[PDB]
Amino acid sequence: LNDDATFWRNARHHLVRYGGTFEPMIIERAKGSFVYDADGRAILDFTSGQMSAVLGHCHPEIVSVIGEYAGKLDHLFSEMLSRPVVDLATRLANITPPGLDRALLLSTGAESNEAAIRMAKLVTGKYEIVGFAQSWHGMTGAAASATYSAGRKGVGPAAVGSFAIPAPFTYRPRFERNGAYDYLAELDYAFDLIDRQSSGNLAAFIAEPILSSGGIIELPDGYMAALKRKCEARGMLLILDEAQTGVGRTGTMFACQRDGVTPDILTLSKTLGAGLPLAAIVTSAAIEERAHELGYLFYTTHVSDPLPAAVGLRVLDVVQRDGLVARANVMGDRLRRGLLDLMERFDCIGDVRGRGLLLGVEIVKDRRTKEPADGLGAKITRECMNLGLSMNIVQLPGMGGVFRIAPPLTVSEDEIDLGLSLLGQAIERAL
Amino acid sequence: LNDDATFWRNARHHLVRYGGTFEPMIIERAKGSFVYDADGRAILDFTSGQMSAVLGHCHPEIVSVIGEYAGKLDHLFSEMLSRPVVDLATRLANITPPGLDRALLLSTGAESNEAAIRMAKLVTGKYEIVGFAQSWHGMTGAAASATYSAGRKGVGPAAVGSFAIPAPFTYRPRFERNGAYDYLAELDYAFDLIDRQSSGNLAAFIAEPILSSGGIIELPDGYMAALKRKCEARGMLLILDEAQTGVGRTGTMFACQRDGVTPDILTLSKTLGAGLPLAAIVTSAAIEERAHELGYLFYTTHVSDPLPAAVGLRVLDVVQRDGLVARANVMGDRLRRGLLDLMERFDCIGDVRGRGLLLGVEIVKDRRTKEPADGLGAKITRECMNLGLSMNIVQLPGMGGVFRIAPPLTVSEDEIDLGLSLLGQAIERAL
Ligand SMILES: *Cc1c(COP(=O)(O)O)cnc(C)c1O
Ligand SMILES: *Cc1c(COP(=O)(O)O)cnc(C)c1O
Ligand code: NA
Ligand code: NA
Ligand code: NA
Numbered sequence: 001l002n003d004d005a006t007f008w009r010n011a012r013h014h015l016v017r018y019g020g021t022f023e024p025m026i027i028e029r030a031k032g033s034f035v036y037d038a039d040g041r042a043i044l045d046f047t048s049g050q051m052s053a054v055l056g057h058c059h060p061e062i063v064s065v066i067g068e069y070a071g072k073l074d075h076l077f078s079e080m081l082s083r084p085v086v087d088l089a090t091r092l093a094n095i096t097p098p099g100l101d102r103a104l105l106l107s108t109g110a111e112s113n114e115a116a117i118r119m120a121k122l123v124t125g126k127y128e129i130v131g132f133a134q135s136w137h138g139m140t141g142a143a144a145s146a147t148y149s150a151g152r153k154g155v156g157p158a159a160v161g162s163f164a165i166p167a168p169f170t171y172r173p174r175f176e177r178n179g180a181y182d183y184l185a186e187l188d189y190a191f192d193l194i195d196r197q198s199s200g201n202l203a204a205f206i207a208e209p210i211l212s213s214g215g216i217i218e219l220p221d222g223y224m225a226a227l228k229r230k231c232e233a234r235g236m237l238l239i240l241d242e243a244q245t246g247v248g249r250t251g252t253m254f255a256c257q258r259d260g261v262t263p264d265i266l267t268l269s270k271t272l273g274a275g276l277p278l279a280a281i282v283t284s285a286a287i288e289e290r291a292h293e294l295g296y297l298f299y300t301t302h303v304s305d306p307l308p309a310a311v312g313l314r315v316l317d318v319v320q321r322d323g324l325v326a327r328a329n330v331m332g333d334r335l336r337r338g339l340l341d342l343m344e345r346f347d348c349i350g351d352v353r354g355r356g357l358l359l360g361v362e363i364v365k366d367r368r369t370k371e372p373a374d375g376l377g378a379k380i381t382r383e384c385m386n387l388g389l390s391m392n393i394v395q396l397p398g399m400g401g402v403f404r405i406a407p408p409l410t411v412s413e414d415e416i417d418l419g420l421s422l423l424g425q426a427i428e429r430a431l
Numbered sequence: 432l433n434d435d436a437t438f439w440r441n442a443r444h445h446l447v448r449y450g451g452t453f454e455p456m457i458i459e460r461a462k463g464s465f466v467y468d469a470d471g472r473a474i475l476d477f478t479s480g481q482m483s484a485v486l487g488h489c490h491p492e493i494v495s496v497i498g499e500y501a502g503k504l505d506h507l508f509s510e511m512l513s514r515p516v517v518d519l520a521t522r523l524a525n526i527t528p529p530g531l532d533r534a535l536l537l538s539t540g541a542e543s544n545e546a547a548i549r550m551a552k553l554v555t556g557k558y559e560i561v562g563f564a565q566s567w568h569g570m571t572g573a574a575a576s577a578t579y580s581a582g583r584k585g586v587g588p589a590a591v592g593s594f595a596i597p598a599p600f601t602y603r604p605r606f607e608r609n610g611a612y613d614y615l616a617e618l619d620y621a622f623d624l625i626d627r628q629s630s631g632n633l634a635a636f637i638a639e640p641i642l643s644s645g646g647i648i649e650l651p652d653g654y655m656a657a658l659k660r661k662c663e664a665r666g667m668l669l670i671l672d673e674a675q676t677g678v679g680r681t682g683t684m685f686a687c688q689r690d691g692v693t694p695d696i697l698t699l700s701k702t703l704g705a706g707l708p709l710a711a712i713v714t715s716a717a718i719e720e721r722a723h724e725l726g727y728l729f730y731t732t733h734v735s736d737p738l739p740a741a742v743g744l745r746v747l748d749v750v751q752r753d754g755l756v757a758r759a760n761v762m763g764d765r766l767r768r769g770l771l772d773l774m775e776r777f778d779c780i781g782d783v784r785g786r787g788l789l790l791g792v793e794i795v796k797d798r799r800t801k802e803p804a805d806g807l808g809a810k811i812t813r814e815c816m817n818l819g820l821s822m823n824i825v826q827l828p829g830m831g832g833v834f835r836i837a838p839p840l841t842v843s844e845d846e847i848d849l850g851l852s853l854l855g856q857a858i859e860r861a862l
């Protein structure tokens with residue numbers, strides 16, 4: 001039973017609480033699309049852990065590779081190269097769009113964003129960073145100065161020179177031009193304000209192709225291109241954070257591929273490591289040469305370590321080999337349609353958005369008023385869990401609560417169906 | 432051969448350069464105290480990789496545990512607890528001094544410092560951070576604002592409210608009081624300046640017990656106690672970063688044990704993971720309760736993940752079980768004496784300092800003038816490598832270059848001797 005006295009005692013006495021509230025089960029094992037409690041109850045992992053386990057839990061290939069390396073090549077002094085590092089870097093250059101040639105291998109998303117922000121500052125000689133008011137780039141420093149979704153209050157001033165602009169949100173438009181939501185005009189409007197506050201040191205713009213923490217907000221068509229143009233005109237670099245969208249999740253290897261806009265710096269993390277701490281930045285040769293001439297330095301304990309790199313490589317091999325990006329379109333289509341059917345059934349589902357296997361469901365009081373549902377999301381979440389479906393909901397000011405759905409790319413037809421089933425029941429139970 | 436055309440081509444074309452310069456070998460395997468090149472040449476790893484592999488490379492126990500977990504429990508959604516997380520947290524509370532009760536499990540040193548700095552700010556409601564002018568706390572944000580050893584130039588303003596004070600350096604004293612280097616008077620002097628610049632928002636002081644990146648600088652006797660008192664009087668928390676000193680390296684489980692001063696927040700990283708990315712913060716129940724009441728939030732992709740925690744636990748078990756802290760005193764004594772004998776032989780060795788298995792050797796022009804050796808350290812380093820001894824030297828302004836010596840706690844008597852031997856030869860060859 002999950003109700004182990006010692007376990008719980010130890011947990012209340014020895015853990016720092018870092019947000020949220022601990023689920024009251026004891027996870028004992030994980031496999032594929034499920035996690036299992038101490039009672040052996042199977043729980044469908046509809047979020048791939050923290051949106052990272054693209055290949056599901058404990059995938060045999062990964063297990064196999066972690067094994068070969070753990071006993072052969074583990075961690076090395078930063079100046080020592082090895083084949084997995086070189087092969088992974090080479091691989092990354094080859095599958096990202098042209099113009100993305102050189103990679104830096106790290107451990108976390110925050111590190112990846114910091115490394116990128118630092119290169120941008122060095123190369124341009126400027127220091128102001130612009131991001132979205134609903135962004136999520138991590139908790140460490142700069143990455144945190146660039147994060148507006150949560151964590152700005154009570155901890156003192158943020159980094160000097162940070163600015164945010166509103167993200168385009170088609171579901172709850174707020175900028176009209178001749179009767180329609182004109183998101184490009186909104187962009188123009190936001191940049192003009194920026195231009196007025198800047199001290200003339202605009203270095204880069206950092207963005208997520210799909211705002212994950214911010215409520216599964218997809219940048220609309222032509223937006224990225226318009227953004228990139230805004231940057232070029234100002235001599236700023238464009239940094240794209242694909243921690244959540246990269247590695248096939250949205251139906252393309254990289255989300256940037258869909259739009260066709262290639263960023264100056266691309267950062268990867270959650271999905272690259274598939275559960276293990278591996279992260280990376282990918283940039284053009286020209287940018288790298290410059291940073292190098294300028295003395296760029298970025299040292300971490302685990303940069304270029306062989307084990308994590310061997311794992312990332314294996315992840316890419318599997319994804320390519322098994323046609324997992326394609327699978328993302330197919331299963332994503334199956335899931336989306338199912339969510340749309342739920343929306344047919346229940347008046348509380350206000351919107352179904354996202355792409356591929358990165359979907360969001362916005363819960364509302366009523367479909368016309370679009371009033372956010374107060375307390376219902378929480379109920380729903382509770383029932384899902386009870387029914388055996390692990391979900392995650394996020395609540396942002398001025399929005400209804402949003403369920404972030406993201407099953408493993410390896411998810412089966414049955415699992416998709418099972419999850420759709422448990423969800424409906426949960427909702428029915430929660431009204 | 433290490434001279435593989437494709438390898439090198441790929442490396443020059445696809446890797447971001449992040450400082451330093453790549454060693455020209457291809458590491459193919461690692462075991463115990465050695466790494467092996469493509470020619471199968473054994474290289475004695477006198478730095479435990481990047482000062483992390485406390486148990487040497489690929490230790491069978493670690494290999495064993497990585498194995499059990501990789502296939503059973505890997506990564507989980509942040510709100511789900513598991514036994515390795517709870518056991519590790521419990522273990523940490525039990526082996527750190529009284530007053531250190533609750534732990535947060537992360538991935539990197541920078542994250543650990545950020546988490547700690549953020550808790551300090553929240554809890555005190557203030558935001559100014561004080562550190563040492565020679566410190567190294569990581570590259571990510573706050574951790575970086577607190578880092579003065581390198582990386583401050585060219586990347587724009589640092590965090591608002593950062594101040595640094597000089598660290599006590601007995602080898603090159605600069606503060607005299609009645610004919611002697613009075614490091615406590617120096618401290619008083621530094622704080623008075625701080626007091627004058629502060630806006631009245633002093634939140635915490637962050638320090639390393641032994642400044643690693645800064646040149647293996649040991650805080651002298653009574654210093655820590657005096658520091659802690661300076662903090663208490665100002666309502667500031669004391670954060671101790673034991674990334675490099677923790678986990679038996681200096682001869683005690685934690686360096687803080689030697690002095691007997693227990694910090695308000697203790698951070699751990701390099702040594703805890705023994706090569707893998709695992710980090711942690713340990714604080715008192717009182718601090719944690721408060722932060723919690725205040726809404727403390729710290730989310731990372733890998734917080735509380737089962738695999739890394741299982742590894743950390745195994746590391747502690749081994750260390751405790753094999754009497755590795757004690758071993759640190761014994762081998763450290765053997766190494767130190769050997770370094771002292773080298774110092775007998777060569778006029779270029781100006782100082783041998785450090786503790787346990789964390790030692791530094793400062794290279795100088797001449798023993799009296801204490802003039803820093805220009806270019807010799809680099810030669811020496813080169814010859815070591817040629818002879819098969821992997822070393823790391825750091826050069827700081829106003830100091831001679833310093834070799835940072837840190838073999839695995841599992842290092843053998845023979846290995847210590849072999850390294851001492853190769854070192855002498857290297858030096859003899861480099862004059
Ligand atoms: C290396 C180090 C850190 C940061 O570790 P990373 O994993 O590189 O972020 C922090 N403090 C000290 C004293 C260190 O040596
Ligand atoms: C999670 C996340 C990051 C940071 O990852 P961490 O490992 O938690 O530091 C950065 N960007 C995005 C878009 C993320 O979702
Ligand atoms: Na490394
Ligand atoms: Na490319
Ligand atoms: Na986790």
Ligand code: NA
Binds near residue numbers: 523528529531
């Ligand atoms: Na304790």
